[PDB]
Design a protein around this ligand. Structure first.
Ligand code: HEM
Length: 153
């Protein structure tokens, strides 16, 4: 875990995302698709997008962006007590979506890149380090759920 002080820095930076969830959501997915093109192959719905301008115009890529960050905000707010919010996500992603754990790592980096690009003034050394342990915790718990569902990539 994170210390009480580290969860506080995490919740505080999250207050910035919550002031514009779909806009931050939309940039996280463009960063991911631009950055690791191969993750795009998992979305039937989006494989047609051939460029950043097309991804930027997609009202559906923006609604999916919103859904991902709304679901991640619900986990973060539990501060580590997220079993229940997490199980269902580990079940769909392992079994239905078939998302390997390095892909969870690539989205973690897109989230940090977005926070840094849009809130540099608020996203200092300290907030950067808490945010990154908070996302490694999420990944590590998801990978553990994977293993007991008996899968794993
Ligand atoms: C921060 C990590 C993530 C969160 C919180 C998250 C959350 C969600 C949620 C809430 C849904 C809708 C319900 C469901 O099927 O469970 C969803 C669907 C989906 N997710 Fe994720 N996700 C994450 C990472 C990823 C990654 C890394 C990929 C693949 C590169 C991915 C692929 C998918 C697909 C293919 C679907 C179905 C989307 C569709 O309707 O076509 N997810 N995700």
């Amino acid at each position: 875990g994170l210390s009480d002080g580290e969860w506080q820095l995490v919740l505080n930076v999250w207050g910035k995302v919550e002031a514009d969830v779909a806009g931050h959501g939309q940039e996280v997915l463009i960063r991911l698709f631009k950055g690791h093109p191969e993750t795009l192959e998992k979305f039937d719905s989006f494989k047609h997008l051939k460029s950043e301008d097309e991804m930027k115009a997609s009202e559906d890529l923006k609604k999916h962006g919103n859904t991902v960050l709304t679901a991640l905000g619900g986990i973060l707010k539990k501060k580590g007590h997220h079993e229940a919010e997490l199980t269902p996500l580990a079940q769909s992603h392992a079994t239905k979506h078939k998302i390997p754990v390095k892909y969870l790592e690539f989205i973690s980096e897109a989230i940090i890149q977005v926070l840094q690009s849009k809130h540099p003034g608020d996203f200092g050394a300290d907030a950067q380090g808490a945010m990154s342990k908070a996302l490694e915790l999420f990944r590590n718990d998801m990978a553990a759920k994977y293993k007991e569902l008996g899968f794993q990539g």
